[PDB]
Ligand binder design. Sequence first.
Ligand SMILES: *[PH-](=O)([O-])[O-]
Length: 490
Amino acid sequence: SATPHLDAVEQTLRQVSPGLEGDVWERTSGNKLDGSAADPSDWLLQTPGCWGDDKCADRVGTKRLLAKMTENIGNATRTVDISTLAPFPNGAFQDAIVAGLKESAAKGNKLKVRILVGAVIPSKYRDELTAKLGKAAENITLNVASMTTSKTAFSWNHSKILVVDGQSALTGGINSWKDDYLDTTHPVSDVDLALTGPAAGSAGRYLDTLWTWTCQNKSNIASVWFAASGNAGCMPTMHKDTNPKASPATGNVPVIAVGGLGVGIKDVDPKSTFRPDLPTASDTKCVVGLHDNTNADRDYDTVNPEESALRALVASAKGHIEISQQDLNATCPPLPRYDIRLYDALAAKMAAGVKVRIVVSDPANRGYSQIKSLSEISDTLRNRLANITGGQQAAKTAMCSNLQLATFRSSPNGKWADGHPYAQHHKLVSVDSSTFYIGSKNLYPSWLQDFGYIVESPEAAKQLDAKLLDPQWKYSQETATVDYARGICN
Ligand SMILES: *[PH-](=O)([O-])[O-]
């Protein structure tokens, strides 16, 4: 097969979540990574993109991110569909959205627009946007909502998607928060991707799934705050109703779109006959009373295929795996400390000689960090390795021979020049310089609505190496507590 990694991930998803195929996950062909002619790798919307410079003077990443948001929205003829984590977009993120909407209106288009956040706010944002659009607002039917799907399971939207006409999609880890990303001399390091094709339709069907729940629950104040322009109603199926069921083809790139429904939207996929072997405990559940959806809830997996997809992506690797995250571990309580099956999958790979690189955010950020020390990751990997290598000594040897583990830097300085630690927020997994995930789903335990793309394209994977992973390792490797390539083993 030309797509061994997607084939494996797809076979897992059809067992886990067959009833959600089409809507919460979907494999498509015919996509394109949407870079420019001058810089074809710039589908990779990293921010700030100021490698080597502790003053972050030339933010080529940020500039491209904001320009691409405006360009995509400005090309809308029918729909603009945005999700993010609250607060609602501000600063130059909001400026980019307003500029694009004004551009589309001036080209003569009448648009439907949805903006969904996970949590007086929605009405205030709607009014700010309408004021800023001026006469362009007459061309726009707007829905704005904030939502929480479960208080007790801490579940709300965490996806960060911008879909236009069901044709183009931007998604990734970037929240639209000016103070953390933009107006600061210690900007957060993160990444989105830009694509076009049928996979953008997949994102539109995912957002229809979320808005269908949101509109059904719009009169329940504890769950949903909703605001619309004029006399407009809630639009649960804007994508289905307005865009073609199969988006046009734009290229040759195969993609698996995958997300999750968190807790409180749907309890189980009734079509699933998935019956997992659930790992033998570990020291993940810090307290006996906590209900652990990540490690001990089969039904949760069936409505959160993204967890299984990411674990399957790791399992598909033949040579090497690079992981860039804010964290691998969560704060307990209320979440379990780690995904046991994920760490087991990484351990299985290292026991087989497949190299694993994990770069996380500096604990000095703890907040863009949830651990005190990298030992909280290496101890856990070592303990899971011990189950499959015969003991603690053989686990340590396997780990030290196959692991790179470090905290993130983007220049030679240990911190930004302004003295603040580097914070990173990517949700990135790449395997074999072939297949990668970029999206909103963290690898640390979390029970939110999330979404992302798994792309199998060696060309694009090589671009990701050159533009992000290689520079990251260049500067980050100085903090490594384990690095097989240099014989480091603390
Ligand atoms: P996310 O925006 O919490 O990772």
